[PDB]
Swiss-Prot record, chains A, B:
Species of the source: Escherichia coli (strain K12)
pH dependence of this protein's activity: Optimum pH is between 5.5 and 7.
Positions annotated to bind thiamine diphosphate: Y368, A392, N393, T394, G417, V418, M419, S444, A445, Y474
Name the record gives this protein: Oxalyl-CoA decarboxylase
CDD domains: TPP_BZL_OCoD_HPCL (cd02004), TPP_PYR_POX_like (cd07035)
Length: 545, 545, 547
């Protein structure tokens, strides 16, 4: 009798389901598991804080449609991981957080166990599902569920709880192998009702001023060719939400991004593609026509009529829907009014002109617009990068200024406006892709995951971090209104040199005060493939609050 | 009619309740509140991550018996703060986390608000209470409750939710002033049943081998003189739990710490003073006599019989209890058997001898024992510091080796074994005391709150950070068992120089490889009162897992 | 080697802790547990629905200060009992609900087990603590905690989860006996700050118009003699809340009940004794002087400053605080001003006279006032009874009109205004005391637990149920506003005869349309000690609608 244990079973389950990376922080009881997973050919990436590890996991699920794996220990590590699990769920990114937990009997009586918490029920409100495995023969089915749940419907976080004892529990090795489940097709296609598809084309054909909105669901769907084809056939102006930038290149002629306010105020029929009417679209109220009619393509029927009533729900998975939308268009082709495209273009150009003047006008110190014009100069010549971006002014201005050329290349604060996602998204993106990453970081944003620069160095990841050091949150020029001369609630240290942090870890730092310095430092950064911080001196007074 | 708003009301409530510091991270909707609080003479301390701010708040409540105040924004900031609120509750440290929340009507319908979450119900499982204020006329009563709840019973975290709209809501300034509540005596004395006090002395008088255990509740109580007096009158050997070190100096003759295992294995009557029989005392099972009888002084009746049956519960607040224990002793004095004190001392000395040999034996590279012998050399000559300590080996060895001379001077990982508490406890301790802090940090532990070094610099706090750089979690010598040469799950960067991090922020760094270097670097550190990192090179193989 | 199992251990643990009654409803996996508990001398009371079993447990807790035991099966049984656990925690009544649950491994993975629900987490929001026991050797200590938690602080419900596997799990009998825990003094006395006590007496001694308020915390504490001596010594007028009626008799010359709103509107110093400034006291807001100063005796510091700022908190158990208050009074005596007592008495008199016209005036049909005057005349002669009461007009009028003479004899809708406590309360009160119970029930109220009349007949309990049948919720005279002639939302069947329900179970029914018939039926009911229903024909227009 050859015998095995839960730890070995779970690692084998992960292997057969083609998990090739784990993002984590170890400690009791999970160290041996991570060692063995690595032993078994799984890439283990160890972080300085579990939050970043969970952010890396979610980033990777967003890029692949395969759930990223976050590994943590019991209560204090689990809780740090839980904050990233929550954010994955909110954003619709698939991931599974696997955490050690303590002794079920002790925790159930609340006697004060090591790292005691009911982790399973603690995760429930933040996860699509929360599963706990008490028997090693159930590990494989439990992972099967975790995988399916994480990628079906609107994708999200799943919590898988592994009590210390299930990892130690033994079974016959042969029988164990029969309990392992390899999931085929974890999220099947769900096709819309044909009649809703035909109503959708019909209402679009009757539209005087149609607009398509592409959200993260559109991006996640990988239906890039189908979307382009639909948009181009009917010449329908579209707006990309932040992380849908690049499905079609941002400089595409049908992009209404440069006159977004005007487009939303005037469109008479709006077609949401995996985009919620949440605060990011002002709930379809402020800045919109009183009378807009909506078509909505969403995988999740519970999202329909969440905010404004939806004339044409088109419920099913987005690729499937666009397949059928395409076929129905071919049977009943139309072209969007030229006058609409034309009035759009009029606004687009006035706005690009005003932008251009801000972008080409040099200043000392640098502001957000000339600084980002410099970044854009370099990124135009380096189109195969991933862009991670977080902050306030640093976020809004980079979103508007940096164009994306390819789909699923932008990672940012997201639906909850989280400061802290940059390092982890940077690591998840580069581990997943093997490509360089540029992280354009506000200086407050940066400090929420800063220590992860050590991890970037430890794994020799090609990430260049560009910090917009304006000396604080929004602006660097706050004053202590007491007359006591203390830093104001929004000030960070006057003239901090973030590029130096890298000295500690044998990585590259540049300090940049001008666009020419910035251009050089950022080009070298990317082309070197070395971990790098670029500290960018930004006028403390360039930001708005 | 002079009019005021919720923001102004809440700041005034905080002022009248003698809140003089707020630890926080701002953003929407709380920036204006922090600015005004600072305007009104409240010291605002702004962090890089809310977790550290909440740790600072809890540290300050532990030292003062006054709840520390943690201020955050809505969902993503609230969630980061929640992880420190949870830890305060677990440890029995008073604090109030005040967070902005969004629009109640939008969140209640789950329509996708800005930073949407039911923060109130999210905090419930981690807090003594969670309150939400919808009317500005209720702000003062709500803060009154927050304060009382946080400090009564076993102290803990309280969540106070302030929707964006209550901060904007206006009322007549004069009437507003009548709605503000100044709490007098937030936690009244609770005196034990006289009969339980007399049973307690009685069972102690009959004891052959009595032992007292002092927990964090004993420490928090500030009953230092009463405890010393009781222990010395009856000559009762005591053990200090980690953060009760220093109530009586650690070198006190009645301290059984150097033969802790023996003391617990043999004591026949154990008197718990604000110490739980949780995992930290192995639940009163493994390493204890089959037949130990317990006396327990605890403020919380729900803690009695949690683990082992308790012969003599003494329920009431600890100062009150020790008052009555003292009076009853005087009426019925006894002395602990000399033979017990003597056998204890026999073990104590054998153990101090073995320790001494590890401590005085020089090595290259340094190990935990000679390194800490060096720290202890410096701390003997600098007794007015606060000691923050976290890690694994760094934690266990510093606990055993560094003596405390005064009460409530040690801050560490605590009941949940949290890596990440060091910077925040360091900042909370120095802001609260005005004294220097020495943080003895494992290198994994450090990276959970590292970025807070900027904050230490921004406020020019006298904190010296001593990092035990063994190159990883527990040990620095892990190997990738795949044969791929990747860092093992436990390795951090080979030879990272954490002292350099300080360059970024205009603070002091030392690298130390020997005890003489360490001694010099640490003395200068403290006496300079400058923010400092000491990177200490530790044999990667000195630790145990 | 003699073996035992979890089921045997928990029963022994109950026995050693002096549990002598369990209220429940059996089924998988607890039927054998109940059988064996009964075999071991524990009295088993089985119900038609678990919520009444849970209501009976919490009544038994309030009466005795020993947690009542409610037993249920898994998910659907559990959830019914949980509604009653909720009510106990809200009212401050100690009880423990012990529920069987299913297989931990299956429920943890949400595979659709038999009766699947994480019952422990389900109970958490409604209970002082929720515990779950996985190992048989942990059963005794789990019960010890449940007991201590249920009775310490402000008492409340505790949930104790017994997975089917733990009940069947075996261990050696001798080793098993060593893991049983007998709790001595589960709620220790907690003594107030003596400074609080001296400040309280001094504020009372400065008051021009002091008022004591007795809450159900005062009734639960069992400090009847200390509260009475304190009140009578300084001659402080007192208001009893509903379930505090009778600590001192309601006819006591110092009761301000007959002038409640005057008393609250005009007192300058008010001493709350286990009484919360919650909605039953209008939060200390509406109907109170603008600057009332409060002294508050409560065991729970969390309750202080909940609503109004409290001038003098006196935190500790009510018996110990009253012991300190009396000793401080004896050192520093004072007598409430005669003028305040005399002016209260003038208002009590105006109100008492208004109430007397209503009570004494005959009507056909009967109304609440003359019907209850007849009930009061009967109850004055039977001061050993327990009074259960619920409904709306039926509750408020009985509460004002039926005087209590002894403490802890009145049981009602309580803090959450629950309809459906009536039969549970009647059963727990009679089983607990051995005494007759009279339940004065609104007809809508009764229907929430009416099938428990079979339980009452099964155990031959001395319960007389008097239903004020006005044909509806508040009133029986509603009309369908659409014109279709359907019953209105507040109507119940016109002229239902609830007295006839008892023929199913060999109980006694009376139907009564007059005060003389009511008086006779109710007297015969009480004396008979037989399960009885009295259907009282009340005017459908007599009631007012709350809101
Ligand atoms: C975890 C978290 N904490 C706090 C906030 C509130 N918040 C919004 S923006 C921001 C930082 C803004 O400054 P910065 O990143 O430096 O960019 P800048 O505006 O200065 O370019 C913060 C802390 C948040 N969104 N997330
Ligand atoms: C937030 C959190 N994450 C993970 C753990 C698990 N854990 C225990 S010790 C430890 C770090 C141990 O190494 P280190 O701090 O460097 O001290 P050393 O043993 O090397 O001296 C970790 C991550 C924890 N307790 N808390
Ligand atoms: C469990 C529950 N359901 C509903 C209510 C709402 N409610 C208040 S009083 C009442 C019944 C009133 O009628 P009745 O009991 O017949 O008294 P009457 O006023 O007619 O004498 C109800 C159902 C409640 N309080 N509890
Ligand atoms: Mg900034
Ligand atoms: Mg280390
Ligand atoms: Mg009725």
């Amino acid at each position: 009798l050859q015998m095995t244990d839960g730890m070995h079973i779970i690692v084998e389950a992960l292997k057969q389901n083609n998990i090739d990376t784990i993002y984590g922080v170890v400690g009791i009881p999970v160290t041996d598991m991570a060692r063995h997973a690595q032993a078994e050919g799984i890439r283990y990436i160890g972080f300085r804080h579990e939050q970043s590890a969970g952010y890396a996991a979610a980033a990777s699920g967003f890029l692949t449609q395969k759930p990223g794996i976050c590994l943590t220990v019991s209560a204090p590590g689990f809780l740090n991981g839980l904050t990233a699990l929550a954010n994955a769920t909110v954003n619709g990114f698939p991931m599974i957080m696997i955490s050690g937990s303590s002794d079920r009997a002790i925790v159930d009586l609340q006697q004060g166990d090591y790292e005691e918490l009911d982790q399973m029920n603690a995760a429930k409100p933040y996860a699509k599902a929360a599963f706990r495995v008490n028997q090693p023969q159930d590990l494989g089915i439990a992972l099967a569920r975790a995988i399916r749940v994480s990628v079906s419907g609107r994708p999200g976080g799943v919590y898988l709880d592994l009590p210390a004892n299930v990892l130690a529990a033994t079974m016959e090795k042969d029988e164990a192998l029969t309990t392992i489940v390899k999931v085929e097709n974890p999220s099947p296609a769900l096709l819309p009702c044909p009649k809703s598809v035909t109503s959708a084309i019909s209402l679009l054909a009757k539209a005087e001023r149609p607009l398509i909105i592409l959200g993260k669901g559109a991006a996640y769907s990988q239906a890039d060719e189908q979307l382009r084809e639909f948009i181009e056939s009917a010449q329908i102006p579209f707006l990309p939400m932040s992380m849908a930038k690049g499905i079609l290149e941002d400089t595409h002629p049908l992009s209404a991004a440069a006159a977004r306010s005007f487009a939303l105020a005037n469109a008479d029929v709006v077609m949401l593609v995996g985009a919620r009417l949440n605060w990011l679209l002002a709930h379809g109220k402020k800045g919109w026509a009183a009378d807009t009619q909506f078509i909505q393509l969403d995988i999740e029927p519970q999202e329909i009529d969440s905010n404004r009533p939806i004339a044409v729900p088109v419920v099913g998975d987005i690729a499937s829907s666009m397949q059928g939308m395409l076929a129905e268009l071919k049977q009943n082709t139309f072209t969007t009014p030229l006058v609409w495209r034309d009035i759009l273009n009029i606004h687009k150009q006035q706005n690009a002109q005003k932008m251009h003047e801000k972008l080409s006008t040099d200043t000392q110190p640098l502001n957000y617009f000339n600084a980002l014009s410099a970044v854009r100069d370099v990124l135009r010549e380096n189109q195969d990068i991933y862009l991670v971006n977080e902050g306030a002014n640093t976020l809004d201005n980079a979103r508007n200024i940096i164009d994306m050329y390819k789909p699923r290349r932008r990672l940012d604060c997201g639906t909850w406006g989280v400061m802290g996602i940059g390092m982890g998204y940077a690591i998840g993106a580069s581990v997943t892709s093997g490509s360089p990453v540029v992280a354009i970081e506000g200086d407050s944003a940066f400090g929420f995951s800063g220590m992860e620069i050590e991890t970037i160095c430890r794994y020799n990841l090609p990430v260049t971090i560009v910090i917009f050091n304006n000396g604080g949150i929004y602006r660097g020029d706050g004053v202590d209104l007491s007359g006591a001369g203390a830093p104001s609630p929004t000030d960070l240290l006057h003239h901090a040199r973030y590029d130096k942090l890298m000295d500690a870890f044998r990585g590259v730092g540049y300090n940049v005060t001008t666009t020419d310095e910035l251009r050089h430092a950022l080009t070298t950064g990317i082309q070197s493939r070395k971990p790098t911080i670029i500290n960018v001196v930004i006028d403390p007074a360039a930001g708005t609050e």
